[PDB]
Amino acid sequence: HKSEVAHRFKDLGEENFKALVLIAFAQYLQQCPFEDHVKLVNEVTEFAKTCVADESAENCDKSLHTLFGDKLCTVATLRETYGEMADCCAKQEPERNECFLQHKDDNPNLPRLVRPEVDVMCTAFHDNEETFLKKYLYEIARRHPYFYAPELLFFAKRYKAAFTECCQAADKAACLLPKLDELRDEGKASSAKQRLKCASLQKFGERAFKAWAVARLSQRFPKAEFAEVSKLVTDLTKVHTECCHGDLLECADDRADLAKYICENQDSISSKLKECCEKPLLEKSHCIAEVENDEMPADLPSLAADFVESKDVCKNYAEAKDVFLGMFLYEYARRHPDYSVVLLLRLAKTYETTLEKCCAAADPHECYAKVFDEFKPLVEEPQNLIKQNCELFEQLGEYKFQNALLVRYTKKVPQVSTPTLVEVSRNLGKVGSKCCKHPEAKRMPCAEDYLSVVLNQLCVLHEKTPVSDRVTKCCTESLVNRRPCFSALEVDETYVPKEFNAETFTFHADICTLSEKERQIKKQTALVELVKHKPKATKEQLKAVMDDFAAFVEKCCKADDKETCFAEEGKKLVAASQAALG
Numbered sequence: 404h405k406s407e408v409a410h411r412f413k414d415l416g417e418e419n420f421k422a423l424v425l426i427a428f429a430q431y432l433q434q435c436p437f438e439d440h441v442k443l444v445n446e447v448t449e450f451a452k453t454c455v456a457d458e459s460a461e462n463c464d465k466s467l468h469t470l471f472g473d474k475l476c477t478v479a480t481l482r483e484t485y486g487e488m489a490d491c492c493a494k495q496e497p498e499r500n501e502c503f504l505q506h507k508d509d510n511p512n513l514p515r516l517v518r519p520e521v522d523v524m525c526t527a528f529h530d531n532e533e534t535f536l537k538k539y540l541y542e543i544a545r546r547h548p549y550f551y552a553p554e555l556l557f558f559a560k561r562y563k564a565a566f567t568e569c570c571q572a573a574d575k576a577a578c579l580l581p582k583l584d585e586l587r588d589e590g591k592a593s594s595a596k597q598r599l600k601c602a603s604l605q606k607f608g609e610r611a612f613k614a615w616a617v618a619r620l621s622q623r624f625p626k627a628e629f630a631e632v633s634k635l636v637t638d639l640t641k642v643h644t645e646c647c648h649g650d651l652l653e654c655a656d657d658r659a660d661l662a663k664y665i666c667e668n669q670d671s672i673s674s675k676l677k678e679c680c681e682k683p684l685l686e687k688s689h690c691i692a693e694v695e696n697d698e699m700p701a702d703l704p705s706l707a708a709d710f711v712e713s714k715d716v717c718k719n720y721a722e723a724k725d726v727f728l729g730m731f732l733y734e735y736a737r738r739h740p741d742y743s744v745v746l747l748l749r750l751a752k753t754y755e756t757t758l759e760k761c762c763a764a765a766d767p768h769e770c771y772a773k774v775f776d777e778f779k780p781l782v783e784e785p786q787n788l789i790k791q792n793c794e795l796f797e798q799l800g801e802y803k804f805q806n807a808l809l810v811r812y813t814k815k816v817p818q819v820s821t822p823t824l825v826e827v828s829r830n831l832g833k834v835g836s837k838c839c840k841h842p843e844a845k846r847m848p849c850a851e852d853y854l855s856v857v858l859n860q861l862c863v864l865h866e867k868t869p870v871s872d873r874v875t876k877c878c879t880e881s882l883v884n885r886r887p888c889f890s891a892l893e894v895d896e897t898y899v900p901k902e903f904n905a906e907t908f909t910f911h912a913d914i915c916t917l918s919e920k921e922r923q924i925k926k927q928t929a930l931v932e933l934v935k936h937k938p939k940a941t942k943e944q945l946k947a948v949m950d951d952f953a954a955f956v957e958k959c960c961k962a963d964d965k966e967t968c969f970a971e972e973g974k975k976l977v978a979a980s981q982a983a984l985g
């Protein structure tokens with residue numbers, strides 16, 4: 404429902420409601436000063452209370468969309484600030500909302516948000532928590548207009564845990580900054596993931612999306628029957644599709660509905676969901692989405708019977724090609740939660756290709772009798788990659804490992820700028836750090852998931868400023884070859900090595916007052932300019948120059964002077980190196 408606003412107020416709570424109204428408005432009106440959206444949020448909140456007291460009350464019968472757009476159209480400066488979005492107001496609902504939806508700016512071109520010093524922040528926090536927290540909720544929201552709002556609220560609450568804990572600890576910066584650094588990471592990864600969820604849907608289409616989802620849901624709910632996994636992916640895809648159009652209210656209802664359906668049918672889905680079905684609306688769906696894998700049914704048969712030995716394989720396949728392949732993929736996925744989703748799609752795509760050849764022939768059982776042999780190599784290639792890389796990592800350590808990567812890729816694609824090489828190799832390094840600590844079981848899902856963050860940003864940066872056809876190839880290619888494409892880059896032996904330049908390999912005393920990290924980005928940048936300039940540098944020729952530079956600093960920051968050792972012994976490093984790397 405009779406009143407939809409009353410119903411969200413009741414269901415969300417007051418604080419949560421005030422929060423999501425702020426985020427809603429911050430994401431359309433991305434230029435009205437904070438101390439001004441607050442006026443709005445209180446006005447919308449005051450109205451909500453009246454509708455809650457009496458659901459007959461004026462304007463309460465209206466739809467969320469209508470109230471929301473009606474409110475957008477009240478702001479005095481709309482036409483001067485936002486220009487042709489004010490043009491949307493001269494329409495009726497539903498068109499008016501489609502019009503508003505289509506005029507959000509993804510790059511609102513604001514100044515970078517600058518983290519104040521820890522003590523400034525903590526003083527601000529204590530002196531007024533509500534205001535400190537909302538001002539920041541406003542600053543993220545208008546920079547990330549497409550970030551599903553309930554997710555922002557969840558980070559919001561984690562920023563508030565980090566402050567309360569750390570702003571009364573012995574050493575606050577030691578407490579606070581890693582927490583803030585992990586939040587930046589996670590915040591950014593999630594933002595990356597959503598834009599890649601949609602992009603994939605638009606380029607590669609719905610069937611590919613469903614394939615991905617069947618794999619993922621079958622690893623997560625491996626006691627569910629194929630019929631229920633399939634029902635869940637049908638609705639799972641409908642919601643992503645709706646959540647990509649970009650309309651918060653519609654997207655949120657579908658998510659609500661799905662969590663609703665999942666909790667009613669727990670018995671038929673998974674035993675690991677009782678914890679999250681007792682949670683309140685706002686959180687239910689976020690939770691289910693991060694739910695841990697249910698233990699798999701004990702002692703299932705192999706697939707051989709249904710997918711190889713059976714005599715009904717071409718008949719079943721021909722009758723409904725995509726339900727069959729989807730069942731193969733369901734029976735595979737639930738058996739192996741230790742596989743990355745993309746491995747499964749590669750396996751499933753291979754089983755597909757042989758059936759098209761082998762069903763088209765006239766001894767089909769004979770032709771495709773050996774199809775499981777082909778899975779072995781594809782399964783083992785990711786496994787080894789993880790093995791060689793996690794045995795390298797634990798014997799070099801994060802930083803040195805980051806540096807093993809830096810020279811590997813600079814030699815492979817030496818036309819990528821030095822900053823992009825530094826950032827990808829540093830993050831790749833961190834993915835190594837993060838998934839090697841896992842047992843072998845949960846490693847591959849781990850790495851798939853962090854690589855796709857690290858490699859998508861690669862493409863996005865390279866998208867606008869491209870300097871390699873091979874990188875471009877790996878980026879536009881299929882989502883099941885993004886990774887192996889890159890893994891196939893060889894050394895660029897056409898490379899014309901960069902001319903020398905004194906400036907880059909000059910260093911000063913400030914480097915000693917640089918922070919652990921800051922110093923590393925510096926050291927690592929020189930390392931890329933060194934490989935660009937001497938690509939044919941044997942590892943050991945480079946190992947020894949890195950050890951010359953290593954002494955050149957320490958035995959020079961620990962010396963009784965100066966600049967000068969920096970100028971005059973740096974003079975003697977450049978000369979020596981040029982000679983030994985020749």
Ligand SMILES: CCCCCCCCCCCCCCCC(=O)OC[C@H](O)COP(=O)(O)OCCN
Nearest residue numbers: 551554597619623642643646658661662688691692
């Ligand atoms: C569902 C996409 C990937 C999730 C991986 C595993 C799925 C597990 C199955 C539980 C179903 C999920 C329950 C509700 C549906 C659900 O959580 O997602 C619905 C759409 O992804 C909407 O995306 P958006 O709202 O922008 O994402 C929020 C996080 N950034």
Ligand SMILES: CCCCCCCCCCCCCC(=O)O
Nearest residue numbers: 611613614725728729748751752
């Ligand atoms: C429940 C039916 C959903 C569709 C399942 C069909 C699976 C298609 C197998 C081929 C894999 C292609 C991989 C891809 O497109 O990235």
Ligand SMILES: CCCCCCCCCCCCCC(=O)O
Nearest residue numbers: 743785788792834835850851886
């Ligand atoms: C650079 C991080 C250290 C170890 C991880 C290397 C990644 C190799 C496996 C990629 C996992 C995704 C599965 C796949 O592409 O099939």
Ligand SMILES: CCCCCCCCCCCCCC(=O)O
Nearest residue numbers: 908926929930949952977980981
């Ligand atoms: C041809 C001029 C050579 C001088 C430039 C040397 C650049 C090497 C960067 C050192 C990275 C090592 C990091 C470390 O081990 O702490």
